Design an enzyme around this catalytic site. Structure first.
Site, PDB file in Angstrom:
ATOM      1  N   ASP A 262      40.345 108.090  83.341  1.00  0.00           N
ATOM      2  CA  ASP A 262      41.463 107.922  84.675  1.00  0.00           C
ATOM      3  C   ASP A 262      40.806 108.591  85.734  1.00  0.00           C
ATOM      4  O   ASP A 262      39.591 108.873  85.818  1.00  0.00           O
ATOM      5  CB  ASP A 262      42.735 108.634  83.972  1.00  0.00           C
ATOM      6  CG  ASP A 262      43.849 108.396  84.411  1.00  0.00           C
ATOM      7  OD1 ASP A 262      43.874 108.082  85.663  1.00  0.00           O
ATOM      8  OD2 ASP A 262      44.917 108.131  83.761  1.00  0.00           O
ATOM      9  N   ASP A 375      44.934  99.825  88.090  1.00  0.00           N
ATOM     10  CA  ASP A 375      46.257 100.393  88.262  1.00  0.00           C
ATOM     11  C   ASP A 375      46.713 100.291  89.552  1.00  0.00           C
ATOM     12  O   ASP A 375      46.126  99.891  90.585  1.00  0.00           O
ATOM     13  CB  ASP A 375      46.093 101.869  87.908  1.00  0.00           C
ATOM     14  CG  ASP A 375      47.180 102.727  87.496  1.00  0.00           C
ATOM     15  OD1 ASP A 375      48.320 102.003  87.235  1.00  0.00           O
ATOM     16  OD2 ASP A 375      47.469 104.073  87.944  1.00  0.00           O
ATOM     17  N   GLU A 378      51.054  96.739  92.068  1.00  0.00           N
ATOM     18  CA  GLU A 378      52.353  95.983  92.325  1.00  0.00           C
ATOM     19  C   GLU A 378      52.437  95.136  93.664  1.00  0.00           C
ATOM     20  O   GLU A 378      53.175  94.357  93.833  1.00  0.00           O
ATOM     21  CB  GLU A 378      53.634  97.085  92.168  1.00  0.00           C
ATOM     22  CG  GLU A 378      53.894  97.424  90.767  1.00  0.00           C
ATOM     23  CD  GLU A 378      52.724  98.259  89.922  1.00  0.00           C
ATOM     24  OE1 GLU A 378      52.209  99.238  90.893  1.00  0.00           O
ATOM     25  OE2 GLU A 378      52.612  98.065  88.735  1.00  0.00           O
ATOM     26  N   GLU A 380      52.134  99.563  94.091  1.00  0.00           N
ATOM     27  CA  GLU A 380      53.291 100.644  93.979  1.00  0.00           C
ATOM     28  C   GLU A 380      53.884 100.798  95.323  1.00  0.00           C
ATOM     29  O   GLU A 380      55.082 101.067  95.290  1.00  0.00           O
ATOM     30  CB  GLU A 380      52.564 101.661  93.316  1.00  0.00           C
ATOM     31  CG  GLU A 380      53.298 102.800  93.112  1.00  0.00           C
ATOM     32  CD  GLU A 380      53.181 103.949  92.294  1.00  0.00           C
ATOM     33  OE1 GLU A 380      53.090 103.864  90.993  1.00  0.00           O
ATOM     34  OE2 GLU A 380      52.919 105.055  92.830  1.00  0.00           O
ATOM     35  N   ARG A 426      48.623  96.210  85.597  1.00  0.00           N
ATOM     36  CA  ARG A 426      49.785  96.768  85.544  1.00  0.00           C
ATOM     37  C   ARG A 426      50.688  95.700  85.964  1.00  0.00           C
ATOM     38  O   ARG A 426      51.955  95.649  85.823  1.00  0.00           O
ATOM     39  CB  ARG A 426      49.985  98.036  86.267  1.00  0.00           C
ATOM     40  CG  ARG A 426      51.127  99.079  85.638  1.00  0.00           C
ATOM     41  CD  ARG A 426      50.997 100.240  86.212  1.00  0.00           C
ATOM     42  NE  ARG A 426      51.688 100.276  87.621  1.00  0.00           N
ATOM     43  CZ  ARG A 426      51.872 101.634  88.170  1.00  0.00           C
ATOM     44  NH1 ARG A 426      51.846 102.624  87.897  1.00  0.00           N
ATOM     45  NH2 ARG A 426      52.466 101.481  89.382  1.00  0.00           N
ATOM     46  N   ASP A 443      54.405 103.352  82.808  1.00  0.00           N
ATOM     47  CA  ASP A 443      54.609 104.720  82.466  1.00  0.00           C
ATOM     48  C   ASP A 443      55.956 105.184  81.619  1.00  0.00           C
ATOM     49  O   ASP A 443      56.721 105.767  82.065  1.00  0.00           O
ATOM     50  CB  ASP A 443      54.488 105.647  83.927  1.00  0.00           C
ATOM     51  CG  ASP A 443      53.232 105.619  84.381  1.00  0.00           C
ATOM     52  OD1 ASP A 443      52.159 105.203  84.023  1.00  0.00           O
ATOM     53  OD2 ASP A 443      53.341 105.679  85.730  1.00  0.00           O
ATOM     54  N   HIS A 503      47.913 106.503  75.123  1.00  0.00           N
ATOM     55  CA  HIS A 503      47.636 106.953  76.391  1.00  0.00           C
ATOM     56  C   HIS A 503      48.918 108.048  76.837  1.00  0.00           C
ATOM     57  O   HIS A 503      49.786 107.381  76.687  1.00  0.00           O
ATOM     58  CB  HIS A 503      47.206 106.012  77.161  1.00  0.00           C
ATOM     59  CG  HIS A 503      47.096 106.330  78.567  1.00  0.00           C
ATOM     60  ND1 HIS A 503      46.018 106.869  79.173  1.00  0.00           N
ATOM     61  CD2 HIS A 503      47.658 106.045  79.968  1.00  0.00           C
ATOM     62  CE1 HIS A 503      46.177 107.111  80.544  1.00  0.00           C
ATOM     63  NE2 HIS A 503      47.165 106.457  80.793  1.00  0.00           N
TER      64      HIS A 503
HETATM   65  C1  LIG Z   1      51.156 109.428  86.643  1.00  0.00           C
HETATM   66  C2  LIG Z   1      51.920 108.668  87.834  1.00  0.00           C
HETATM   67  O1  LIG Z   1      51.802 109.520  88.903  1.00  0.00           O
HETATM   68  C3  LIG Z   1      52.801 108.929  89.781  1.00  0.00           C
HETATM   69  O2  LIG Z   1      54.178 108.889  89.442  1.00  0.00           O
HETATM   70  C4  LIG Z   1      54.797 109.734  90.284  1.00  0.00           C
HETATM   71  C5  LIG Z   1      56.014 109.158  90.641  1.00  0.00           C
HETATM   72  O3  LIG Z   1      55.556 108.362  91.889  1.00  0.00           O
HETATM   73  C6  LIG Z   1      57.344 110.057  91.263  1.00  0.00           C
HETATM   74  O4  LIG Z   1      58.374 109.389  91.571  1.00  0.00           O
HETATM   75  C7  LIG Z   1      57.628 110.734  89.881  1.00  0.00           C
HETATM   76  O5  LIG Z   1      58.880 111.122  90.024  1.00  0.00           O
HETATM   77  C8  LIG Z   1      59.892 110.832  89.283  1.00  0.00           C
HETATM   78  C9  LIG Z   1      60.967 110.058  89.689  1.00  0.00           C
HETATM   79  O6  LIG Z   1      60.378 108.916  90.185  1.00  0.00           O
HETATM   80  C10 LIG Z   1      62.134 109.872  89.055  1.00  0.00           C
HETATM   81  O7  LIG Z   1      62.300 108.438  88.967  1.00  0.00           O
HETATM   82  C11 LIG Z   1      62.005 110.471  87.829  1.00  0.00           C
HETATM   83  O8  LIG Z   1      63.464 110.471  87.275  1.00  0.00           O
HETATM   84  O9  LIG Z   1      61.750 111.756  87.953  1.00  0.00           O
HETATM   85  C12 LIG Z   1      60.213 111.631  88.046  1.00  0.00           C
HETATM   86  C13 LIG Z   1      59.788 113.015  88.341  1.00  0.00           C
HETATM   87  O10 LIG Z   1      58.407 113.480  87.741  1.00  0.00           O
HETATM   88  O11 LIG Z   1      56.564 111.631  89.727  1.00  0.00           O
HETATM   89  C14 LIG Z   1      55.514 110.857  89.033  1.00  0.00           C
HETATM   90  C15 LIG Z   1      54.220 111.854  88.805  1.00  0.00           C
HETATM   91  O12 LIG Z   1      54.666 112.675  87.742  1.00  0.00           O
HETATM   92  C16 LIG Z   1      52.662 107.339  90.249  1.00  0.00           C
HETATM   93  O13 LIG Z   1      53.566 106.517  91.009  1.00  0.00           O
HETATM   94  C17 LIG Z   1      52.420 106.322  88.690  1.00  0.00           C
HETATM   95  O14 LIG Z   1      51.881 105.442  89.193  1.00  0.00           O
HETATM   96  C18 LIG Z   1      51.406 107.086  87.948  1.00  0.00           C
HETATM   97  N1  LIG Z   1      51.079 106.448  86.611  1.00  0.00           N
HETATM   98  C19 LIG Z   1      49.807 105.596  86.839  1.00  0.00           C
HETATM   99  C20 LIG Z   1      48.694 106.317  87.307  1.00  0.00           C
HETATM  100  C21 LIG Z   1      47.705 107.101  86.390  1.00  0.00           C
HETATM  101  C22 LIG Z   1      46.962 107.950  86.709  1.00  0.00           C
HETATM  102  O15 LIG Z   1      45.813 107.443  87.375  1.00  0.00           O
HETATM  103  C23 LIG Z   1      47.611 106.290  84.940  1.00  0.00           C
HETATM  104  O16 LIG Z   1      47.366 107.570  84.017  1.00  0.00           O
HETATM  105  C24 LIG Z   1      49.005 105.419  84.461  1.00  0.00           C
HETATM  106  O17 LIG Z   1      48.607 104.838  83.369  1.00  0.00           O
HETATM  107  C25 LIG Z   1      49.126 104.834  85.574  1.00  0.00           C
HETATM  108  O18 LIG Z   1      50.438 103.775  84.923  1.00  0.00           O
END
Ligand SMILES: C[C@H]1O[C@H](O[C@H]2[C@H](O)[C@@H](O)[C@H](O[C@@H]3[C@@H](O)[C@@H](O)[C@H](O)O[C@@H]3CO)O[C@@H]2CO)[C@H](O)[C@@H](O)[C@@H]1N[C@H]1C=C(CO)[C@@H](O)[C@H](O)[C@H]1O
Ligand SMILES: O=C([O-])C(=O)[O-]
EC number: 2.4.1.161
Length: 780
Positions: A262, A375, A378, A380, A426, A443, A503
């Site tokens: 990652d 990753d 979209e 994003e 994704r 996620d 994961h």
């Molecule tokens: C790991 C992910 O990080 C980022 O996610 C953020 C997201 O953008 C925030 O909005 C979120 O807060 C959310 C709110 O959106 C709300 O809807 C919810 O109820 O409360 C949450 C509070 O935590 O915080 C997270 C960070 O924790 C990013 O946008 C997201 O794309 C990330 N996931 C991807 C990235 C990685 C890391 O390289 C991969 O491990 C993962 O597989 C991938 O899908």
């Protein structure tokens, strides 16, 4: 008010002129038609079609009030006044335009009463999406659980219980209203982009899907290692941690094919480094040695990459200099806030962006990277005023990930023409499977609800082109402590879905090797089972490449005349022979399985069940999830290995589930070198076939092999055939006409060629399966 004025049949397309403009109809096959409105103007090209310039010979006939444009099985009926097109398979109406096309872009169709509608890609709304409306705009849904009208990977397509598939071949921010606003109206909308749709017909659900992938693209066979065990988390912080994890799999004796790195591979922090696209040497000091050391143990390395280059990253200046980033209307690189920092997006739709991005993939691949994880496609974050080479962000949005996969796929094939690309992403579009896209469901929360939604998501994606859709096993998002029972249930289900990739965020371990003794004792033999079942899984993969047949199939395939089955999102078929019912709540003591009428066996216990329709009730346990085997199944196994690099098929063990109710059954096992992207096309494979003929007094097996074979193919395989529910009245076996006695004792304690175990009702035959046809006849 729209009406027909005139047409021109040239060539081989139908070009109709109404009072509102030109419409172009072209058959992309005997079962699929592309319908392009505003045909006279310049628009974005098709993204959904694998051969967009195709047009096969159709017949055109004209009456006073209609035109008919007919291919082999599909016919378009064009009413002149008012203007409306309807689609027929045989004489059966599939779908009729209501107002049809209108102007910003709008398509309106009638829905039939009782017609059930799957589609839209990833939504958690129920299998039949009729009565729902939702955006067509790929978008993250962090921490989703039991509901979503909008997530990572939407598809502008539906599958109807009328057995057609409709594709809105449009890449723009849009919407789908499946008889929500108006009960009998399907409405497709988009702010811009191509004004076209594609209708595909079929005579059965498998045929529909074969026809759909015929025109949208077939997934190339993934490397066999894609079917093995992945070590992954968010995320290994260092080369030391990565090496320790590979070592943990070895010392804990769990199979491991691939470790996934990652975002810490390119930076010390989550934010601020994205776009570096190069090793963080403080924490990964000797990456070439690391990857080589892993290859020595048969372990591949996959790295994450993203579309965004941050202004704080080491590649900002160079990306700007290369003109590789999307621009604002003023002409500067566009920079904007996203979760990871402030930055721009690589314009994969441009020559400059493509060349720049591709050269980076090439460089890292040369260093030893075996596969790629893309990753945030979209994308994003994608501000409206962002300008790509071929349109603004809102116009191209839903095809960004699709084009990104195309670029990477083409790049990988050009660099390694003798290997199959591994590309996990994704977000994509209809047809992205033709670039080998392997999607995962983003996620997902670490909750039972998150697990409970996975079959619905997988089936919805599988039905519309994506055989390798899968989830972050064990769950990804948040959580503060491991929910042990949930984790176990998730990794059990994992064995019976396309890609075995636990994961999650690393404050809780996602890898099974880091779990407690009880969890490991439960999961170790299941991860090994996954490996032992490679012949079954890889054969289903082969079929997916051939025909588009998904690896996971919905219950409704079992009875196409029973539309009520469409609602089921709790039991599904894994390949042809296994009916799987994941456990998706804590403490469940028993399950009611709506097995199709016929004979079924408990996969774990060998129990025989017969049903004429009523569901079967099975008790649950913590070490398995309920799996039934269909009578007539040939279940093929090889011995478990630690990595598919060590795979051998010298030893085969095949389990045939006999029942008089199945007088004829067939099985196949596809074998090749596991890596050649041209193996199928060049017939460099070993296709093993088994046919069982089961009558009152005889059970006969015919075994054969076809194909030109491959390097390292065994000429002769030691084969153990175990016949479950075997009659205790078989007295002799003929093998190619030579009669052999069947022993009736000590079957497990002697090197017997044929023996019947009376306590298990299993008849075991052990023999050599060479290249020539082999016939085994049991006679009472
Ligand atoms: C790991 C992910 O990080 C980022 O996610 C953020 C997201 O953008 C925030 O909005 C979120 O807060 C959310 C709110 O959106 C709300 O809807 C919810 O109820 O409360 C949450 C509070 O935590 O915080 C997270 C960070 O924790 C990013 O946008 C997201 O794309 C990330 N996931 C991807 C990235 C990685 C890391 O390289 C991969 O491990 C993962 O597989 C991938 O899908
Ligand atoms: O099916 C049979 O032949 C039996 O069970 O004896």
């Amino acid at each position: 008010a729209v009406f027909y004025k005139e047409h021109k049949l040239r060539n081989d397309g139908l070009v109709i002129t109404t009072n509102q403009g030109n419409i172009r109809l072209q058959f992309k096959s005997e079962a699929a038609i592309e319908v392009l409105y505003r045909a006279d103007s310049k628009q974005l090209p098709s993204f959904a079609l694998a051969q967009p310039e195709s047009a096969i010979k159709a017949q055109l006939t004209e009456t006073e009030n209609h035109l008919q444009f007919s291919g082999g099985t599909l016919t378009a009926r064009i009413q002149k006044r008012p203007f409306a097109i309807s689609y027929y398979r045989d004489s059966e109406l599939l779908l009729a335009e209501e107002s049809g096309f209108q102007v910003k872009i709008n398509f309106r169709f009638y829905l039939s009463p009782g017609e059930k509608i799957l589609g839209g890609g990833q939504r958690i709304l129920g299998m039949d999406r009729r009565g729902q409306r939702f955006p067509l705009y790929n978008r993250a849904h962090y921490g989703y659980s039991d509901h979503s009208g909008q997530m990572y990977f939407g598809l502008p397509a539906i599958m109807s219980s009328k057995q057609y598939i409709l594709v809105f071949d449009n890449s723009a921010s849009g919407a789908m209203d499946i008889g929500k606003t108006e009960s009998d109206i399907l409405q497709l909308e988009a702010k811009s982009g191509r004004s076209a749709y594609i209708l595909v017909a079929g005579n059965s659900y498998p045929s529909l899907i074969e026809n759909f992938t015929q025109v949208t693209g077939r997934q190339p066979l993934p490397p066999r290692w894609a079917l093995g065990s992945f070590a992954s988390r968010f995320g290994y912080r260092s080369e030391a941690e990565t090496r320790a994890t590979v070592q943990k799999y070895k010392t804990e004796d769990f199979p491991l094919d691939t470790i996934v790195l990652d975002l810490y591979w390119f930076g010390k922090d989550i934010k601020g480094h994205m776009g570096n696209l190069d090793w963080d040497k403080e924490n990964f000091p000797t990456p070439l040695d690391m990857m080589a050391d892993f290859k020595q143990q048969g372990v591949k390395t996959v790295l994450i990459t993203e579309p965004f280059v941050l202004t704080s990253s080491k590649r900002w200046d160079d990306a700007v200099k290369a003109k590789a980033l999307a621009k604002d209307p003023q002409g500067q690189p566009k920079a904007f806030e996203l979760y990871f920092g402030n930055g721009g997006i690589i314009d994969v739709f441009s020559k400059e962006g493509s060349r720049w991005f591709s050269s980076i993939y090439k460089d890292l691949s040369k260093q030893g990277v075996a596969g790629w994880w893309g990753d945030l496609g979209e994308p994003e974050m994608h501000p409206e005023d962002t300008q790509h080479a071929i349109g603004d962000a809102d116009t191209v949005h839903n095809a960004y990930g699709h084009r990104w996969a195309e670029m990477l796929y083409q790049q990988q094939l050009d660099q390694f023409p003798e290997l199959r690309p591994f590309i996990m992403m994704r977000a994509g579009f209809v047809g992205s499977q033709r670039y080998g896209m392997i999607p995962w469901t983003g996620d997902v929360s670490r909750t039972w609800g998150g697990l409970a939604s996975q079959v619905e998501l997988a089936l919805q994606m599988s039905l519309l082109g994506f055989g390798y859709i899968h989830s972050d096993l064990g769950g990804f998002a948040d959580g503060e402590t491991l929910d042990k029972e949930m984790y176990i249930r998730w990794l059990q289900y994992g064995v019976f879905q396309p890609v075995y990739r636990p994961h999650g965020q690393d404050h809780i371990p996602s890898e099974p090797v880091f779990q407690d003794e009880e969890t490991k004792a439960i999961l170790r033999p299941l991860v090994k089972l996954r490996y032992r079942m490679l012949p079954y899984i890889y054969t289903a993969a082969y079929q997916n490449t051939l025909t588009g047949m998904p690896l996971m199939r919905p219950l409704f395939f079992s009875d196409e005349k029973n539309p009520a089955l469409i609602d089921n999102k709790t039991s599904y078929f894994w390949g042809d022979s296994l009916l799987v019912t994941p456990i998706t709540q804590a403490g469940v003591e028993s399950v009611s399985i709506p097995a199709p009428k016929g004979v079924w066996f408990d996969f774990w216990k060998d129990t025989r069940y017969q049903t004429d329709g009523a569901p079967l009730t099975l008790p649950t346990d913590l070490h398995t999830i309920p799996v039934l085997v269909k009578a007539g199944a040939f279940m093929p196994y090889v011995p478990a290995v630690s990595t598919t690099e060590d795979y051998r098929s010298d030893s085969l063990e095949i389990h045939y589930y006999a029942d008089a109710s199945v007088p004829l059954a067939q099985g196949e096992i596809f074998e090749d070198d596991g890596k050649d992207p041209n193996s199928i096309k060049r017939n460099q494979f070993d296709l093993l076939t088994l046919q069982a003929t089961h009558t009152d007094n005889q059970l006969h097996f015919q075994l054969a092999r076809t194909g030109k074979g491959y390097r390292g193919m065994p000429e002769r395989r030691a084969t153990t055939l175990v016949i479950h529910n075997a009659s205790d009245q078989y007295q002799h076996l003929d093998i190619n006409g030579k009669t052999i006695a069947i022993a009736q004792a000590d079957c497990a304690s002697t090197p017997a060629l044929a023996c019947y175990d009376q306590e298990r009702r299993q008849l075991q035959l052990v023999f050599t399966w060479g290249r020539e046809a082999l016939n085994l006849r049991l006679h009472k």
